[PDB]
Amino acid sequence: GIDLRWKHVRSSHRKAPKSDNVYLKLLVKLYRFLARRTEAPFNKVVLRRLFMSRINRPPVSLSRIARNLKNGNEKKTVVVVATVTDDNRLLQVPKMEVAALRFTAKARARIEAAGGRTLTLDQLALEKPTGANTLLLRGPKNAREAVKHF
Amino acid sequence: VRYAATEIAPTKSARARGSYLRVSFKNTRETAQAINGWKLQRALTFLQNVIDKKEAVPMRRYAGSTGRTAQGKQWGVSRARWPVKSAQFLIGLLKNAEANADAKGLDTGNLIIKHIQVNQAPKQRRRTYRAHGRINPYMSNPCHIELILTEAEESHLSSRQRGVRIRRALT
Amino acid sequence: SNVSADLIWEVSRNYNSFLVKQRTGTFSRDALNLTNQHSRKHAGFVNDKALGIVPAEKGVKVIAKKVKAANKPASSLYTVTYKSTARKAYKAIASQAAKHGYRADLRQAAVARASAILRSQRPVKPEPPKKLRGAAARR
Amino acid sequence: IWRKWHVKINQGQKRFATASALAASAVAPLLMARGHQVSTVPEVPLVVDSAA
Amino acid sequence: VAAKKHVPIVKKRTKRFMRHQSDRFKCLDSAWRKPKGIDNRVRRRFKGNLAMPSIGYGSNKKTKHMMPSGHKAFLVHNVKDVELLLMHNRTYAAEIAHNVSSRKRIDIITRAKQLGVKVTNAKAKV
Amino acid sequence: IPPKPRKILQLLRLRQINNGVFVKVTKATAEMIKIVEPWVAYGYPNLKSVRELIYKRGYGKVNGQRIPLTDNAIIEENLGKYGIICIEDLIHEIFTVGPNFKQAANFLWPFKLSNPNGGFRPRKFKHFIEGGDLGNREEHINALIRAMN
RNA sequence: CCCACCCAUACCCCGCCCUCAGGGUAGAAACGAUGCCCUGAGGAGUAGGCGGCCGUGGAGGUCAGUGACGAAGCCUAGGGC
RNA sequence: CGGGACCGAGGACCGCGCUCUGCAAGGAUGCUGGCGUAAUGGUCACCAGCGACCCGUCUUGAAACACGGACCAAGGAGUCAA
RNA sequence: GAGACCGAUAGCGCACAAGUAGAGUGAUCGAAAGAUGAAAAGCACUUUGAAAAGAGGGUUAAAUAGCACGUGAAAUUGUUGAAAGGGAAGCGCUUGUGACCAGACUUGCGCCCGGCGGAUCAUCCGGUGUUCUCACCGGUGCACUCCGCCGGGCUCAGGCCAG
């Protein structure tokens, strides 16, 4: 016998999505290839967040994007691996280039009306395969009723 | 109807049977086992002797707490009895089979009991009254009987083995 | 667009009507499936370029997908019957499988399937009689 | 009898599923994978003239 | 035809795993059941008792589901079913299903002879 | 086993019976070994014991894995920054206790020895000076290593 | 006190199973990528927790499925996984 | 330098090497004989050597006590709603 | 009029002369129990028995369906065959004996000769289709070229146990 005071630890992170979305499966295959064949940490972060569940992908609004676009970030490509929502409190949308998992209809319309560009994550992989000149944004994770009641 | 001994052809044999016969299955089993494999005339004479209490049927399986007699010494036992009713039923069946053989044209004097078998019939359900207002079964255990009478009647060796055999045949 | 060979494979990889699943393996009834095995490489109905071989009365009949007629099933198959020497059939099949970059990964399987069909079209030899063995079977 | 026999589905999800099925009906490999005999069909989706 | 060359087929255990006390009770089938009693000697693995099945008895991955000839069985119901084994005559053998009639069995056997596919139960219904 | 000897054996990487390790003799290690004396036999190995242990049962720890020392490229890939490029350099470092003894001895996976050919003394769990096998047996550890390797 | 010897599921070497971990695999001659290839370690278990599979009655789809040239059921010191 | 035992995983080449026309160097080949069938192998029944308490259930820390079980077939117990 | 309900120990207590038969002074309590076969063709006639029935012999597609009736499991029993047994049997590991069996194998592929039977040999021309350079079809082969078959010879690979 071998005395094992310590225990070998099985993985406590997602290795694959629980979702059955076929397009998400194709995106996961593409970003698995990118994370394997590139040095860019952006690709690994994007792959890991593609694995994530919905409460771990809180929505990001246009006002949050506009806040993070200030101070030299106006020309960077905004990357969100959640839903980009519209904020009607923001009356003037700045010109921006946003790549997201999905957009609401009003957010897409307001970005295109302000003159920015809307992309999917496979288009982001085509144009910035190393994540160059990107601004990676996450939504407020703790802004949930369950988290308030914890 | 299908008899249990299916290997016996019907052309040179005689058969008889009886069903739902209200006679003791255990006593009938002992009597049939006593006359199993015998000649027909010897079996008939023995069963008449059983009725007349001159020859006894040895009790072998269904024999618990029965009596003893001097007539079991012919069979090498001490427990033997005289099941008259079983003997009468078996005499009737054996005589029916003898008549069947005579109709078929077989020689009666050379016939042997090749197959004889007693099976349990469905039980007759009477009731008896016991103490304290209780009712118990008082059942009869009848039997089916069937009987059939018939007439009394160097390869792949090794090369060394082959060479040894050839040399031993030569010398 | 919304439709591709990868998308069709994701849709039909767990179940389709050509699937034959048993304990010892998963087979496919697809006419465009060389080796009749369930995989993305051999899923001919899934793939944009695909080959299938069926027996003819004499020789083989090879079907290939036309890429510009994927929405026209009546005119989507390029069909050639090879009823000649087996070497000529193998040469032509390898040519349409490898020379112009049309599924070069399938040329071994295609030549093997043509060889199997042409081999099956030979007369069968009479089997030796069954040898009875032992005691109960021999007597 | 007061078991839940019926299922309430969002109308948007119903319309999504109907649109997805309509898009899948235009893919000729999916017709063969669902078991339809469409080898002699001249074009998918098959449109016949309304005069007929 | 002869099977594809393979490593020798090793069975770690050929005896079945008999259920405890099924030899003594006729209402107990011999099919294996794990004893869940806290004081059970088979469950506690006292020596001289019945063995318990476990993953250590598992067969070699290269020879799993191989019959002694080296083929894997594939159940077939008709000629089109047996024609799926056209490319796999060195690895797969055909087992005709039990509810196939004698004429269809004759057709299946003839087609499998043409394809060079071994039939495991070719002598039946003849 | 009490928790303090259990912890000392864990820190010495003696997690299994007939596991063996090389230790540089300091006071800080000598007191530990003196505490775990009821479970260990230890001594002063010679060059033959060192080289035969490393040649026959030498396994390096590479990325957490136990890799046999069958080529000098493995030793150069894992210990080359300390000047150890071959198995003879590793043996020299272990035997002479060089400046990189910690790295060499920790690179060596704990040696998994067999039971001794010839067995132990009749009462195994007594001290060596009392006729048993436990404790410091000094240069007599080479006979045990020869029987066990 | 000394020499030799006996054997545990303990220790050493080798095979096989499973689990865990670490790597490789697309201008695809390309894959049940839910696959395959390489390397290492580990294996008792009540209460309790989790995962994967097997089986039964019924429903949708599918296999152009089986069947009076014999379906289902039942018996079987006959076999295969 | 002898004598013996057990094993042969892998499956084009690639590597580290050496005594370098080649090799014992990232895992067995070569030669030969008998047989080609119940001979090997398997299943069943029995003898033989060794091994081996009757199952739940309850109790406490555990045993013992106690309780259930003559046998077989069919039902037979964490479900539905808010 | 219907059902992702139940399928005769289920579903109403009741698929049947069921709120019946039966029980209780009474109020009330309250079962069990479906299926030969397509068609009775439900066994003429002979024979043995007092009879019940038995045996022949018909009827049927089948009586291995005989108003005990579709199928006919287990407990339990009879006969036959095999075996064991000096105060329990049963079970595990491993041989042995006896009995009974599943596979595997029967030859394949490739060269060199000889004999047949045919020209879907190579090239070129035209047409057509294609993945746009690859193929198919018709003409040309005039037999040192292709394709099958039959006789020999040779190499290699082939089943079981062994040295």
Side-chain angles (χ1 to χ4, degrees), chain A, chain B residues 1-5 8-10 13-152 154-171, chain C, chain D, chain E, chain F:
Chain A
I2 306 129
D3 158 82
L4 296 177
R5 190 250 182 271
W6 320 109
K7 174 190 173 192
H8 293 312
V9 190
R10 197 189 51 191
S11 171
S12 69
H13 296 255
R14 270 184 181 188
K15 296 174 170 177
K18 288 275 193 176
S19 169
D20 266 307
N21 194 344
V22 285
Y23 300 108
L24 187 65
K25 285 180 179 187
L26 294 181
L27 252 174
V28 156
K29 286 186 179 179
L30 161 78
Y31 266 100
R32 275 197 207 280
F33 179 80
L34 282 182
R36 182 161 50 81
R37 299 291 307 278
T38 59
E39 310 292 32
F42 172 86
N43 293 336
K44 303 182 177 63
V45 174
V46 163
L47 176 65
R48 251 195 42 95
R49 290 185 191 177
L50 283 174
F51 294 158
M52 280 189 196
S53 69
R54 195 192 268 200
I55 62 157
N56 291 312
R57 297 179 286 104
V60 175
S61 98
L62 291 184
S63 80
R64 174 173 296 254
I65 292 180
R67 170 199 174 93
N68 294 282
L69 276 170
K70 299 177 184 183
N71 306 336
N73 290 347
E74 301 77 2
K75 294 174 273 112
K76 296 197 173 187
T77 293
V78 175
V79 180
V80 173
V81 165
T83 305
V84 166
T85 55
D86 172 39
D87 200 344
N88 48 44
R89 301 166 298 185
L90 177 68
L91 299 195
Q92 253 64 240
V93 179
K95 178 164 134 62
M96 35 168 105
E97 170 152 325
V98 190
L101 199 52
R102 50 179 301 262
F103 291 82
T104 65
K106 258 205 187 39
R108 187 189 316 268
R110 287 188 79 192
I111 286 170
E112 293 161 344
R117 198 158 63 110
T118 275
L119 314 95
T120 54
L121 300 191
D122 70 292
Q123 272 163 330
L124 171 79
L126 251 189
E127 272 147 69
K128 323 263 204 162
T130 56
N133 215 235
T134 51
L135 175 61
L136 193 57
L137 294 190
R138 264 188 292 203
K141 177 183 180 181
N142 283 356
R144 202 156 55 87
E145 262 287 299
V147 187
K148 292 184 208 139
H149 294 351
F150 284 163
Chain B
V1 65
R2 285 173 43 78
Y3 283 61
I8 325 191
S13 67
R15 51 190 52 194
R17 66 185 300 112
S19 278
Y20 310 96
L21 311 170
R22 203 164 180 190
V23 63
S24 169
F25 155 79
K26 290 184 175 192
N27 294 347
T28 315
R29 187 260 163 191
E30 301 298 320
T31 322
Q33 279 291 98
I35 71 178
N36 200 352
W38 281 9
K39 274 148 167 334
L40 176 61
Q41 282 66 57
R42 170 59 188 141
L44 287 167
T45 303
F46 169 76
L47 294 179
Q48 192 54 50
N49 283 336
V50 163
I51 294 173
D52 294 338
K53 268 86 169 187
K54 323 302 324 163
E55 276 189 295
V57 176
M59 318 299 288
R60 302 185 178 273
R61 173 176 300 149
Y62 305 120
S65 287
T66 57
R68 304 191 285 194
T69 179
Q71 294 188 18
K73 279 183 297 204
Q74 327 276 87
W75 311 84
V77 307
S78 58
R79 298 178 293 175
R81 269 183 181 179
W82 301 267
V84 171
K85 204 172 175 184
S86 302
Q88 287 165 341
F89 272 78
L90 280 176
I91 278 176
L93 274 190
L94 277 174
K95 273 191 172 124
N96 181 255
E98 175 177 47
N100 297 338
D102 294 347
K104 213 164 301 259
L106 309 176
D107 184 23
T108 278
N110 210 248
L111 292 173
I112 63 161
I113 309 179
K114 190 70 226 293
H115 173 78
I116 177 163
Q117 152 179 312
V118 178
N119 264 340
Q120 293 184 33
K123 297 161 190 318
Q124 180 102 17
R125 317 245 175 198
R126 269 187 308 173
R127 296 140 291 270
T128 176
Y129 296 93
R130 316 300 300 262
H132 314 302
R134 197 189 298 271
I135 297 190
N136 275 170
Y138 196 74
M139 279 185 310
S140 307
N141 307 267
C143 55
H144 306 312
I145 311 170
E146 56 175 74
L147 68 103
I148 302 167
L149 315 172
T150 44
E151 301 277 25
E154 291 278 342
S155 178
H156 320 291
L157 299 182
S158 71
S159 66
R160 313 165 294 268
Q161 268 171 314
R162 283 193 303 277
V164 165
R165 271 151 168 92
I166 285 301
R167 174 149 167 266
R168 284 200 208 287
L170 282 177
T171 88
Chain C
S1 64
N2 56 322
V3 181
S4 77
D6 316 75
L7 186 273
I8 296 163
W9 179 248
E10 304 293 323
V11 162
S12 56
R13 63 196 288 196
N14 295 305
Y15 164 74
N16 56 83
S17 74
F18 305 121
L19 213 61
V20 179
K21 184 189 310 205
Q22 278 179 37
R23 276 173 71 214
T24 54
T26 305
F27 289 84
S28 187
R29 297 179 188 278
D30 191 6
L32 295 158
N33 200 320
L34 322 164
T35 81
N36 286 109
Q37 248 159 10
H38 179 61
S39 66
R40 164 71 193 282
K41 172 211 280 242
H42 288 301
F45 79 99
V46 160
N47 288 311
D48 271 23
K49 298 176 294 186
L51 303 153
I53 311 181
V54 291
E57 218 300 287
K58 199 234 165 195
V60 295
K61 164 171 142 187
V62 175
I63 51 181
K65 274 200 175 189
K66 300 195 227 156
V67 290
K68 316 139 300 302
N71 60 312
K72 307 198 213 303
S75 45
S76 70
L77 290 177
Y78 167 53
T79 305
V80 185
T81 298
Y82 303 112
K83 38 168 160 45
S84 270
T85 84
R87 301 195 235 251
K88 256 191 143 194
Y90 303 154
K91 177 199 189 310
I93 282 162
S95 279
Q96 45 189 156
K99 273 191 167 302
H100 306 106
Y102 190 103
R103 304 301 309 271
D105 57 310
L106 296 181
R107 67 135 282 280
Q108 186 271 326
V111 171
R113 188 170 183 90
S115 168
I117 292 177
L118 293 174
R119 173 96 98 162
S120 80
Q121 283 174 2
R122 278 154 74 231
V124 301
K125 302 294 101 213
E127 60 220 45
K130 218 238 172 183
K131 270 128 53 196
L132 268 38
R133 191 155 54 151
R138 277 192 79 88
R139 284 305 56 201
Chain D
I1 65 173
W2 51 83
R3 189 209 295 271
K4 225 181 93 181
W5 310 95
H6 296 79
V7 178
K8 162 187 162 59
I9 314 159
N10 291 1
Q11 198 173 26
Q13 297 185 282
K14 286 175 163 185
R15 288 163 165 173
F16 206 136
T18 302
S20 283
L22 281 172
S25 86
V27 186
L30 289 179
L31 266 47
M32 285 136 54
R34 219 207 73 83
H36 291 292
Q37 289 297 123
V38 293
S39 69
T40 71
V41 168
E43 201 194 24
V44 165
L46 184 52
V47 178
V48 76
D49 187 8
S50 277
Chain E
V1 301
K4 185 167 78 124
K5 174 208 201 111
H6 58 94
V7 301
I9 301 169
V10 167
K11 312 286 194 184
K12 292 175 174 165
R13 180 188 168 108
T14 50
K15 199 174 183 178
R16 298 192 63 91
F17 282 93
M18 180 190 84
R19 184 186 172 170
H20 187 49
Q21 292 185 314
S22 61
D23 51 306
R24 293 179 58 234
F25 293 90
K26 288 187 176 184
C27 73
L28 300 184
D29 194 40
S30 69
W32 169 254
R33 298 291 184 271
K34 205 202 217 330
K36 316 198 192 316
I38 204 53
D39 274 315
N40 191 277
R41 323 278 296 182
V42 172
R43 183 200 72 81
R44 291 160 80 195
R45 311 200 194 102
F46 278 101
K47 85 165 175 174
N49 282 271
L50 286 148
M52 270 160 126
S54 67
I55 212 54
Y57 292 98
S59 290
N60 196 326
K61 276 176 290 172
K62 296 181 170 194
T63 47
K64 193 170 182 181
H65 300 308
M66 274 190 190
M67 79 186 30
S69 84
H71 300 92
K72 290 177 180 177
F74 180 72
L75 198 69
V76 287
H77 296 255
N78 47 65
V79 171
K80 279 169 55 181
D81 285 11
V82 91
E83 272 156 350
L84 294 168
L85 305 182
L86 160 82
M87 291 319 285
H88 312 270
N89 67 352
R90 300 208 70 194
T91 45
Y92 276 93
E95 208 152 80
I96 301 178
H98 77 287
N99 52 350
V100 184
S101 69
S102 49
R103 275 185 307 160
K104 191 159 283 181
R105 276 177 201 268
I106 284 146
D107 311 323
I108 289 161
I109 286 163
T110 301
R111 192 76 188 110
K113 265 180 221 303
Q114 284 169 337
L115 298 185
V117 176
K118 163 189 170 170
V119 176
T120 65
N121 51 338
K123 316 189 298 293
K125 286 199 172 198
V126 169
Chain F
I1 172 162
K4 170 189 288 190
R6 179 185 326 111
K7 225 274 192 292
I8 298 181
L9 289 178
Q10 155 203 331
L11 290 175
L12 290 175
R13 312 185 297 165
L14 302 174
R15 284 144 73 250
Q16 194 180 13
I17 196 174
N18 299 331
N19 283 7
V21 284
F22 288 114
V23 183
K24 175 184 180 183
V25 176
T26 68
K27 197 175 189 279
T29 58
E31 301 308 310
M32 281 170 90
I33 301 166
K34 273 186 243 300
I35 297 176
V36 280
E37 271 194 355
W39 293 265
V40 306
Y42 66 100
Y44 316 140
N46 59 6
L47 174 70
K48 172 184 185 167
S49 292
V50 167
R51 67 185 256 104
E52 272 179 21
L53 276 160
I54 292 180
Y55 276 133
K56 186 187 178 173
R57 304 202 187 263
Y59 294 76
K61 178 176 52 174
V62 186
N63 303 330
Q65 296 190 331
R66 183 178 178 257
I67 305 304
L69 302 175
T70 56
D71 204 283
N72 287 326
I74 303 156
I75 293 156
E76 195 195 23
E77 267 152 4
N78 297 277
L79 291 181
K81 64 166 103 63
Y82 313 113
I84 305 170
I85 73 184
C86 76
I87 192 161
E88 282 288 335
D89 305 347
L90 174 66
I91 289 170
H92 176 260
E93 195 82 9
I94 293 298
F95 183 58
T96 62
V97 196
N100 300 299
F101 181 87
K102 167 172 192 157
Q103 284 82 32
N106 190 253
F107 170 68
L108 285 169
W109 200 278
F111 298 86
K112 291 144 57 70
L113 311 177
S114 173
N115 270 312
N117 192 12
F120 294 94
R121 284 168 161 186
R123 298 321 298 260
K124 180 187 171 186
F125 301 128
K126 284 151 46 198
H127 210 285
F128 181 76
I129 65 187
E130 302 151 351
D133 287 279
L134 295 164
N136 196 359
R137 65 172 68 199
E138 294 187 355
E139 262 278 299
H140 294 263
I141 204 69
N142 295 308
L144 190 62
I145 288 167
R146 215 73 60 237
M148 258 156 84
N149 188 22

